[PDB]
């Protein structure tokens, strides 16, 4: 189960909506996972606690 959202450049986080609430998760440090473009689409994989903040739409 993956959840899509928008990343914050300043915070290096992925923001997403789930269950009527806002959530925020750390993008991480990999060069291909950190938030590099403000509000870029990002994905949070709940099963494996992995986040990718460079996933194109
Ligand atoms: Zn922050
Ligand atoms: Zn949450
Ligand atoms: Zn892009």
Q: Say if CB 33 and CB 54 are below 8 A apart.
A: yes
The rounded Å distance from CA 40 to ligand 3 centre is: 6
Say if residue 42 is exposed, middle or buried (CB neighbours under 10 Å; 0-12, 13-18, 19+): buried
Q: How far apart are CA 36 and CA 19, in angstroms?
A: 27
Output DSSP code: residue 37.
S
Closest CA to 23 of 36, 38, 11: 11
Q: How far apart are CA 2 and CA 18, in angstroms?
A: 11
The rounded Å distance from CA 19 to ligand 2 centre is: 9
Structure tokens at 2: 């993956």
Domain residues for the domain of 54 are 1-57
Structure tokens at 14: 């992925």
Output DSSP code: residue 10.
T
Q: Say if CB 37 and CB 8 are below 8 A apart.
A: no
Domain total in the chain: 1
The rounded Å distance from CA 16 to ligand 1 centre is: 14
């Amino acid at each position: 189960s993956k959840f899509g959202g928008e990343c914050s450049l300043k915070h290096n986080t992925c923001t997403y909506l789930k269950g009527g609430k806002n959530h925020v998760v750390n993008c991480g440090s990999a060069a291909n996972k950190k938030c590099k473009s403000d509000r870029h689409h990002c994905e949070y994989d709940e099963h494996h606690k992995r986040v990718d903040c460079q996933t194109p739409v």
